[PDB]
Chains A and B, each alone.
Chain A
Amino acid sequence: EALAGAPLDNAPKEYPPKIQQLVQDIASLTLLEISDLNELLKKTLK
């Protein structure tokens, strides 16, 4: 409910925890499933 403060300019790169789950989920899926996902993605983004 309260946005996190800005990270220091010199602090090491930090990535939000909510995406850490998304990063792992992509590896589990199969290329054929990723490929099908991608075809719909490219069209949806246009």
Chain B
Amino acid sequence: AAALARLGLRPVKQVRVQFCPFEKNVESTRTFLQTVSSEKVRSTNLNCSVIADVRHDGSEPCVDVLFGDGHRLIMRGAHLTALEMLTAFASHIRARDAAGS
């Protein structure tokens, strides 16, 4: 959260974290929720919604990020680590922010 709080959530408009907690492949996605739901990260931009959608459909976990530019980032966490998703999420924040300005 410290590393992600330095960069901020300024270009981000929504972050939706979808997982089925009774499945066995959601730990990375739940760890991603823990980091982005932190008060430090969330306080960098109060206009960015962070949503946790819990399901019991048997579907694979997903992280759907909507930026203010209108672009989307979909990270499927069934075979991704929390570090990888946070690294990719940081990279796209570092890019989309430059495009807007």
A residues whose Cβ falls under 8 Å from a Cβ of B:
5-6, 8-10
How far does the alpha carbon of A35 sit from the alpha carbon of B22 in the complex, in Å? 45
Q: How many residues of B contact A (CB 8 A)?
A: 5
A to B contact number (C-beta, < 8 Å): 10
User: DSSP class of A's interface residues: helix, strand, loop or mixed?
Assistant: loop
Q: Are A9 and B22 in contact (CB under 8 A)?
A: no
How far does the alpha carbon of A6 sit from the alpha carbon of B57 in the complex, in Å? 11
How far does the alpha carbon of A28 sit from the alpha carbon of B11 in the complex, in Å? 68
Query: Closest CB-CB distance, B32 to chain A, in whole Å?
Result: 23
Q: Are A6 and B22 in contact (CB under 8 A)?
A: yes
Note all chain B residues with C-beta closer than 8 A to A8: 56-58
